[PDB]
């Protein structure tokens, strides 16, 4: 067919019922354009609340999960719980999980496999740090992260890859369109060489890292950029602008 | 005297149907006025559990982070816990320390922030088998408690929970004497390092294996003030554990 544009909003650790409820009302009233898939990832305490308040046109994602269905893992949640709350996606391998919390590639792979086996979709995050970019090892870094993810994916129809260069997260330093395109094209080439043409052609690779209303149109114009995983702007009315990046 | 305290840690178990069924049975139970009961659901169900549980049972989160909002994908803050109607958070649980590698420094920062946002804290401590066998039970639990105490101004909203991690999946089994031994030392630690008033007023609850069959003997120990219950908290015998002071 042709890759459906994908816009995810990662609220991170922000919001309460009152102000997230006001956010959700605004999103509910927005017209979601054709061939566009919108997903919001609330704080874990509000997955249920957000699913109840959001229009079904918008899917709900968890911001993380663990790798078994139930167990002695105080503070964690499972894909089963996520499904049970009406959510259909999980974000895995986010930069903050890797770099603030130290989650290993191996662990992230195990979570991807479990989440997929349980019937969730996965937004799987990769990305290099400034020091890695400056050393010229971007490709090595992101290919290695992608490989561990791929080793644990048996159905790519339920996966979206999110490239979020760590130097672009929370800094205002959005990748230029050319920079995002360069990495996205390389990641798609990796899928083609290492999985299949069909998987390469159908898998959304979305860009994250200071996506704003002012920058989204030029980014979305790049041939191998299939949408966004949005951070700070996901909490504001300009998220709707980003949803309309191809209009 | 110290009010008997029974927490149920559901860990990463349950869905709306079976947790809703568990809650129905808890609402039906006579919760004694002399016992403080708290349930800690999985984080996806804090809100659900608070909405379904009778006000006689308080709700706790199983963890939180150390600032009120921020770019911490997968975390929740004390403000969110409070906003969901929960009034406690469990911090420093053995699984957070030993499966997920949370440091004492981070646990102390979480303690300070949680208390600053008006939550109660169930602060967990405990030594692993290799620490016990190296003779450093005391150094380990005292240093854990010191970090906690360094981040507590008002102990009225804190409960300490001792977890004999050395008896978890090691093939070792903790006796009531061994529980009492540690609890008595922890109270002595508070007396000498914080104040006698804090030592006498602070609940120190037992976070090792407890069941309906064993709860009365454990609760009879002079320095055991209740329980942070694991697996039995999902079962009918939790109602009996709630009645273990009497
Ligand atoms: Mg990595
Ligand atoms: Mg160089
Ligand atoms: Mg070919």
Curated annotation (Swiss-Prot), chain A:
The modification N6-methyllysine is found at residue 192. The modification N6-succinyllysine is found at residues 147, 154, 192. Pathway: Carbohydrate degradation; glycolysis; D-glyceraldehyde 3-phosphate from glycerone phosphate: step 1/1; Carbohydrate biosynthesis; gluconeogenesis. One of its GO terms (cellular component) is cytosol. Asn-14 and Asn-70 undergo deamidation which gives rise to four extra negative charges. These are expected to decrease subunit-subunit interactions and so expose the hydrophobic interface to the aqueous environment. It is found in: Cytoplasm. It comes from the Eukaryota. The modification 3'-nitrotyrosine is found at residues 66, 207. Homodimer. This is Triosephosphate isomerase. It comes from Oryctolagus cuniculus (Rabbit).
């Amino acid at each position: 067919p042709s890759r459906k544009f994908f816009v995810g909003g990662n609220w991170k650790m922000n919001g309460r019922k009152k102000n997230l409820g006001e956010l959700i009302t605004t999103l509910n009233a927005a017209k979601v354009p054709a061939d566009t898939e919108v997903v919001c990832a609330p704080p874990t305490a509000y997955i249920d609340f957000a699913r109840q308040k959001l229009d079904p046109k918008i899917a709900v994602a968890a911001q993380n999960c663990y790798k078994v269905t139930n167990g002695a893992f105080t503070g964690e949640i499972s894909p089963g719980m996520i499904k049970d709350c009406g959510a259909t996606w999980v974000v895995l391998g986010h930069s903050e999980r890797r770099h603030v919390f130290g989650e290993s590639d191996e662990l992230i792979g195990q979570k991807v496999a479990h989440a997929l086996s349980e019937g969730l979709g996965v937004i799987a995050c990769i990305g290099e740090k400034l020091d890695e970019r400056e050393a010229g090892i971007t490709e090595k870094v992101v290919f290695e992260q992608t490989k561990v993810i791929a080793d644990n994916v048996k159905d790519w129809s339920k996966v979206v890859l999110a490239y979020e260069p760590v130097w672009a997260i929370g800094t205002g330093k959005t990748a230029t369109p050319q920079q995002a395109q360069e990495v996205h094209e390389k990641l798609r080439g990796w899928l083609k060489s290492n999985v299949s043409d069909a998987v390469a052609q159908s898998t959304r690779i979305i860009y994250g890292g200071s996506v704003t209303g002012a920058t989204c149109k030029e980014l979305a114009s790049q041939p191998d950029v299939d949408g966004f995983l949005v951070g700070g702007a996901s909490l504001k009315p300009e998220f709707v602008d980003i949803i309309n990046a191809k209009q």
